[PDB]
Write a protein that binds this DNA or RNA. Structure first.
Ligand SMILES: [Mg+2]
Ligand SMILES: [Mg+2]
Ligand SMILES: [Mg+2]
Ligand SMILES: [Mg+2]
Ligand SMILES: [Mg+2]
Ligand SMILES: [Mg+2]
Ligand SMILES: [Mg+2]
Ligand SMILES: [Mg+2]
Ligand SMILES: [Mg+2]
Ligand SMILES: [Mg+2]
Ligand SMILES: [Mg+2]
Ligand SMILES: [Mg+2]
Ligand SMILES: [Mg+2]
Ligand SMILES: [Mg+2]
Ligand SMILES: [Mg+2]
Ligand SMILES: [Mg+2]
Ligand SMILES: [Mg+2]
Ligand SMILES: [Mg+2]
Ligand SMILES: [Mg+2]
Ligand SMILES: [Mg+2]
Ligand SMILES: [Mg+2]
Ligand SMILES: [Mg+2]
Ligand SMILES: [Mg+2]
Ligand SMILES: [Mg+2]
Ligand SMILES: [Mg+2]
Ligand SMILES: [Mg+2]
Ligand SMILES: [Mg+2]
Ligand SMILES: [Mg+2]
Ligand SMILES: [Mg+2]
Ligand SMILES: [Mg+2]
Ligand SMILES: [Mg+2]
Ligand SMILES: [Mg+2]
Ligand SMILES: [Mg+2]
Ligand SMILES: [Mg+2]
Ligand SMILES: [Mg+2]
Ligand SMILES: [Mg+2]
Ligand SMILES: [Mg+2]
Ligand SMILES: [Mg+2]
Ligand SMILES: [Mg+2]
Ligand SMILES: [Mg+2]
Ligand SMILES: [Mg+2]
Ligand SMILES: [Mg+2]
Ligand SMILES: [Mg+2]
Ligand SMILES: [Mg+2]
Ligand SMILES: [Mg+2]
Ligand SMILES: [Mg+2]
Ligand SMILES: [Mg+2]
Ligand SMILES: [Mg+2]
Ligand SMILES: [Mg+2]
Ligand SMILES: [Mg+2]
Ligand SMILES: [Mg+2]
Ligand SMILES: [Mg+2]
Ligand SMILES: [Mg+2]
Ligand SMILES: [Mg+2]
Ligand SMILES: [Mg+2]
Ligand SMILES: [Mg+2]
Ligand SMILES: [Mg+2]
Ligand SMILES: [Mg+2]
Ligand SMILES: [Mg+2]
Ligand SMILES: [Mg+2]
Ligand SMILES: [Mg+2]
Ligand SMILES: [Mg+2]
Ligand SMILES: [Mg+2]
Ligand SMILES: [Mg+2]
Ligand SMILES: [Mg+2]
Ligand SMILES: [Mg+2]
Ligand SMILES: [Mg+2]
Ligand SMILES: [Mg+2]
Ligand SMILES: [Mg+2]
Ligand SMILES: [Mg+2]
Ligand SMILES: [Mg+2]
Ligand SMILES: [Mg+2]
Ligand SMILES: [Mg+2]
Ligand SMILES: [Mg+2]
Ligand SMILES: [Mg+2]
Ligand SMILES: [Mg+2]
Ligand SMILES: [Mg+2]
Ligand SMILES: [Mg+2]
Ligand SMILES: [Mg+2]
Ligand SMILES: [Mg+2]
Ligand SMILES: [Mg+2]
Ligand SMILES: [Mg+2]
Ligand SMILES: [Mg+2]
Ligand SMILES: [Mg+2]
Ligand SMILES: [Mg+2]
Ligand SMILES: [Mg+2]
Ligand SMILES: [Zn+2]
Lengths: 126, 119, 146, 50, 87
RNA sequence: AAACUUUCAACAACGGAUCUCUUGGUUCUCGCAUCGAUGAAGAACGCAGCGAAAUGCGAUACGUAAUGUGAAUUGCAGAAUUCCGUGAAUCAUCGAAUCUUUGAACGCACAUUGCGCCCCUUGGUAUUCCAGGGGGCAUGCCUGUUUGAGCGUCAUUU
RNA sequence: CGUGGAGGUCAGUGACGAAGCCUAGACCGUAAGGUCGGGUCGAACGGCCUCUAGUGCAGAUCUUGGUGGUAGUAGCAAAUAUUCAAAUGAGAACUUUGAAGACUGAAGUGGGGAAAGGUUCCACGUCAACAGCAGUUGGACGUGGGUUAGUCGAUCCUAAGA
RNA sequence: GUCGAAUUUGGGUAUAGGGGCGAAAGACUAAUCGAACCAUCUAGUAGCUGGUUCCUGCCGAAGUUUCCCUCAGGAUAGCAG
RNA sequence: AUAUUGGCGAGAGACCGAUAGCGAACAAGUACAGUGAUGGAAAGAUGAAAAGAACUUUGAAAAGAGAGUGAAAAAGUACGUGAAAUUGUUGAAAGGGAAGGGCAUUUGAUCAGACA
RNA sequence: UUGACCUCAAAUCAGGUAGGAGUACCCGCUGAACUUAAGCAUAUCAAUAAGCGGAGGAAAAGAAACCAACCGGGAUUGC
């Protein structure tokens, strides 16, 4: 259990801190786990999802589908995959909204910084 | 697009001055266009640029004055530390630490002695 | 408003007493804060022991005089028979009291002997720099019982 | 009225500006809650008390 | 005639707007505000008036300045600017 | 016999109980000491590409600078050069600024966007009139500076 | 006996349907109540030993909310008054235009102002609500336009007074 | 009724609550007047009026004694568990 | 060492659960009232996702009827569940100046259990 | 004539300070009545509410013109 005096087990406080979290904080909550491949590749279990990454839906009814993240919708706590959409009745397609904890990262998108993140978590990077 | 601050700080006092008129002339014209087109988001950028210039002109005219006052009594009130009205008038460390001549000889001759109880 | 056979109570709640109720909900809180207080101080205070040497003293009136109890400070006389001045004894952790007088030799000697044993059982580090680390005893009251 | 102080006209102007309905694009925003304008005012219904 | 027909004569304001609080409590002939006490240097309020108090206290406003004083205190009233590390 | 009234049921009304929710409230405890003439608290009016409000801000106006993060914002449009980068962002932080008309509110007033004075400057052929730009002038009190007043009063002239 | 919550326990019930609600269907208890079926429903909940209380309603001209009978009832009756046609429109007793009949009778139902309102002005669009019948009409609704001063007011002056 | 004046009336201004104003009615003082309105003291006190929420089981009254500015109430004894 | 229904920051509860809890869980000290001092509400819940109903047909329109979406429209921005008073329909039954109730039985309807 | 002195002035004289806010807690002033007494004035409510002045992170108090009467104790604050 919590041993620190600055942690709060309070449920009402957690749920406030989630929904009222600023854009910067949602970035890290919106982490997705690396694929078993990419994990032993990079020596790292999970990373905050970013836009042009590549991803496989491992949960839900889009289970098995893959694509490129078209946008991180931080406001909505949802990530959108280009290639995963609803065809509507009038035929106009519309994005589905996915949660990064139900995705898996199959290809990263690397930066000077995106690399340094992997290095700051203590893992190899091919 | 839009003006960058670190790039303004290298421009001359009169260079930035003419940038500002150029931006104003720019912004003045855009407002004519805005009432024909049914949106003009480019205008937000040029009015932010003006703001960004005026800051820089101000920043430099201030650090000019701040240094040619630097190090002396009586510099203008808006270059003095803001702090708090009370902190402002709190005794300086010098007239706090001040100690009576008789008091000083006593601190010297009988300071609090470090000691301990065992043997 | 008077009936049966009952003691006559005197319960003074005719003012606005609910305004002035004090429930000590902070008992546990303030005990911790007092323990932390003492801890933080024992650290700031170097090997010095949190408390000062206190004299033997005979407790007043007819009811308590049979018992002897710790006083405030040591009476410039008793300080002087133990061979140190007031000013220095204060820096040494001995409490001095200019107001207390000695009408009684037996107590007078007890406090001089108390001062003697204390002087022997302490070490006073040099003014210089060295501070030869000595491991604080926290009491004086416990080391020098009355 | 019909000869007014500028302070009176100024307030009078700000109340003209506040007299529109809910701009309908707000209705579409994420978590949008406001439905209509509930501060809407009419000249023969509620009086401005200056 | 003390009712509806006499109400038909009410066209003259007793109070206009108050410069200080803008409440329409500013008594014209008395030249003082029944709400905030202006022109009086001090501000009208009473301890029998708890709601009236809660309506106007500090915090019902923008606190344009007092807003930031506690953060500025948190940082020890930093005079200066922040330098750099990278990124 | 219907209709009508009444009772029960089913389905549909009306209405919003109930159950289950909870970014709110209440109460306790712990830590801390920071408003204002360096213009506070409060007020008014403004500010977005498309806003009435709420929140934010002040003609540099849902913000400017700085610092950290490291790609968003998102209702629509939008820019596109912002993506291995002095760099996205209704982000976080905040140390530099701006900060209208006011307010203890201070040139005088104020049911008035009313009315003076001084200084520097620019224009109108201008020390004097008009106009634009900038900077100023409340009160009590303290220390000090300077110009003074009084046969209150000392001396010094010839 | 029954409610909210608390300690323990039955490794209790449940998205293969918890709770709730409905049911002149069933069973247990003298009773407070308990139990089951069926329907509806959608995320939680109960038995037992104990703890605890903001713990059980028919009333209080009780509090708040909702709803009846009254009842398609009282009524929509002051200010003399309307009528024919055409146009428009899904729709015309009620809008527009033409015609007729009247009225206010310059102490006006006329032409402007002060106080007060504050956009009601004007145009275009337009009928869900509103104008106690109606509505294509409006002081309504939507979207826009409009208030130009050396001489008209303020501003200056003084009045009771402040 | 009166209608050229102790006339009517707008605006400005003064008078404020045990106070004002009153050609005097306790009238008027913002539908409020034999003491306005607002908040607070205040959940004022009430021997008085109204209400007081589940079941069953057993027992089961009093309206009388004495004292009380007591007589619509208490204390006291009695009856009751 | 002591105080603290204010302020800044924190950890909590055998607390309340939208008529409760602060008046305010919401554009709440708001809307609104009052000349003014002051007075001061109501108002949370579609769904995992708007997938917020393309298209056809009737209509002047609003809408209806199909269709479509959805795990479900017995979830349709009147939106979780959706009680009661009270209302429509349908079915059943009774009714000479109320209705309702107790004991008992006829008749109709309905139902448990128990035989083996 | 000139130069001091005392006291009193004026400056948009050089530099400063005060106001207002908040006010839970703190230091003062001022100050009720409802209420209780089964009535009521002294009393009570209460050295309370309302009103006024002034501080702080605590305020105030504090090194005895104290307590005591003992074999005496020994600033203040608080439990
Ligand atoms: Mg991480
Ligand atoms: Mg007591
Ligand atoms: Mg406490
Ligand atoms: Mg100690
Ligand atoms: Mg040293
Ligand atoms: Mg009207
Ligand atoms: Mg209003
Ligand atoms: Mg109002
Ligand atoms: Mg008046
Ligand atoms: Mg006055
Ligand atoms: Mg003033
Ligand atoms: Mg939920
Ligand atoms: Mg809580
Ligand atoms: Mg915004
Ligand atoms: Mg950088
Ligand atoms: Mg930001
Ligand atoms: Mg002034
Ligand atoms: Mg002005
Ligand atoms: Mg000027
Ligand atoms: Mg002087
Ligand atoms: Mg029980
Ligand atoms: Mg239940
Ligand atoms: Mg039934
Ligand atoms: Mg059964
Ligand atoms: Mg069920
Ligand atoms: Mg659910
Ligand atoms: Mg129990
Ligand atoms: Mg109760
Ligand atoms: Mg009831
Ligand atoms: Mg009843
Ligand atoms: Mg009853
Ligand atoms: Mg009722
Ligand atoms: Mg009808
Ligand atoms: Mg009729
Ligand atoms: Mg009639
Ligand atoms: Mg008629
Ligand atoms: Mg007609
Ligand atoms: Mg005629
Ligand atoms: Mg005539
Ligand atoms: Mg209609
Ligand atoms: Mg109307
Ligand atoms: Mg109508
Ligand atoms: Mg109609
Ligand atoms: Mg309009
Ligand atoms: Mg003129
Ligand atoms: Mg003028
Ligand atoms: Mg009175
Ligand atoms: Mg009186
Ligand atoms: Mg008086
Ligand atoms: Mg009234
Ligand atoms: Mg009246
Ligand atoms: Mg009561
Ligand atoms: Mg009462
Ligand atoms: Mg009686
Ligand atoms: Mg019996
Ligand atoms: Mg008597
Ligand atoms: Mg009786
Ligand atoms: Mg607290
Ligand atoms: Mg509520
Ligand atoms: Mg309750
Ligand atoms: Mg409420
Ligand atoms: Mg729900
Ligand atoms: Mg609901
Ligand atoms: Mg349909
Ligand atoms: Mg269908
Ligand atoms: Mg369902
Ligand atoms: Mg549903
Ligand atoms: Mg729909
Ligand atoms: Mg429903
Ligand atoms: Mg029966
Ligand atoms: Mg059977
Ligand atoms: Mg059977
Ligand atoms: Mg000066
Ligand atoms: Mg003050
Ligand atoms: Mg009382
Ligand atoms: Mg009494
Ligand atoms: Mg009494
Ligand atoms: Mg009495
Ligand atoms: Mg007293
Ligand atoms: Mg007294
Ligand atoms: Mg007080
Ligand atoms: Mg005060
Ligand atoms: Mg302070
Ligand atoms: Mg302390
Ligand atoms: Mg002394
Ligand atoms: Mg003592
Ligand atoms: Zn005011």
């Amino acid at each position: 259990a919590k041993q620190s005096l600055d942690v709060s087990s309070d449920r009402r406080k957690a749920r406030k801190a989630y929904f009222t979290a600023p854009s910067s904080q949602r970035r890290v909550l919106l982490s997705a786990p690396l694929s078993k491949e990419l994990r032993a590749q990079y020596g790292i279990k999970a990373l905050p999802i970013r836009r042009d990454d590549e991803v496989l839906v491992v949960r839900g009814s889009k289970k098995g589908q893959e694509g490129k993240i078209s946008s991180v919708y931080r406001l909505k706590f949802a990530v959108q995959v280009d290639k995963v959409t609803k065809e509507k009745v009038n035929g106009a397609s519309v994005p589905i909204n996915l949660h990064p904890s139900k995705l898996v990262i199959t290809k990263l998108h690397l930066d000077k910084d995106r690399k340094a993140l992997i290095q700051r978590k203590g893992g190899k990077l091919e | 697009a839009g003006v960058k601050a670190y790039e303004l700080r290298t421009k001359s006092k009169e260079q930035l001055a003419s940038q500002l008129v150029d931006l104003k002339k720019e912004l003045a014209e855009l407002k004519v266009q805005k009432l024909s087109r049914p949106s003009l988001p480019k205008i937000k950028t040029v009015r932010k640029s003006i703001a960004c210039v005026l800051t820089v002109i101000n920043e430099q005219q201030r650090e000019a004055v701040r240094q040619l006052y630097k190090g002396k009594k009586y510099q203008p009130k808006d270059l003095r530390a803001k702090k708090t009205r009370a902190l402002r008038r709190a005794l300086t460390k010098f007239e706090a630490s001040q100690v009576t001549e008789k008091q000083r000889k006593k601190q010297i001759a009988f300071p609090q002695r470090k000691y301990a109880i065992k043997a | 408003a008077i009936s049966k056979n009952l003691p006559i109570l005197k319960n003074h709640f005719r003012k606005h007493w609910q305004e002035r109720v004090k429930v000590h909900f902070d008992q546990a809180g303030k005990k911790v804060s007092r323990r932390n207080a003492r801890a933080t101080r024992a650290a700031k205070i170097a090997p010095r022991p949190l408390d000062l040497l206190r004299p033997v003293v005979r407790a007043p009136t007819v009811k308590y005089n049979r018992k002897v109890r710790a006083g405030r400070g040591f009476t410039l006389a008793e300080v002087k028979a133990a061979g140190l001045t007031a000013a220095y004894a204060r820096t040494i952790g001995i409490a001095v009291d200019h107001r207390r007088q000695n009408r009684n030799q037996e107590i007078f000697d007890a406090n001089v002997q108390r001062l003697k044993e204390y002087q022997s059982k302490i070490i006073v580090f040099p003014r210089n720099g060295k501070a030869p680390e000595a491991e604080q005893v926290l009491s004086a009251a416990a080391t020098f019982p009355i | 009225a019909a000869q007014k102080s500028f302070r009176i006209k100024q307030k009078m102007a700000k109340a003209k500006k506040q007299n529109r309905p809910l701009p309908q694009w707000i209705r579409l925003r994420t978590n949008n809650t406001i439905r209509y304008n509930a501060k809407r005012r009419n000249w023969r219904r509620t009086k401005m008390n200056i | 005639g003390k009712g509806t027909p006499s109400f038909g004569k009410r066209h003259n304001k007793s109070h206009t707007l108050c410069n200080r609080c803008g409440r329409r409590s500013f008594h014209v002939q008395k030249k003082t505000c029944s709400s905030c006490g202006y022109p009086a240097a001090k501000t009208r309020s009473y301890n029998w008036g708890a709601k009236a108090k809660r309506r106007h206290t500090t915090g019902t406003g923008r606190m344009r300045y007092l807003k930031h004083v506690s953060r500025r205190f948190k940082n020890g009233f930093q005079t200066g600017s922040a330098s750099k590390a990278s990124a």
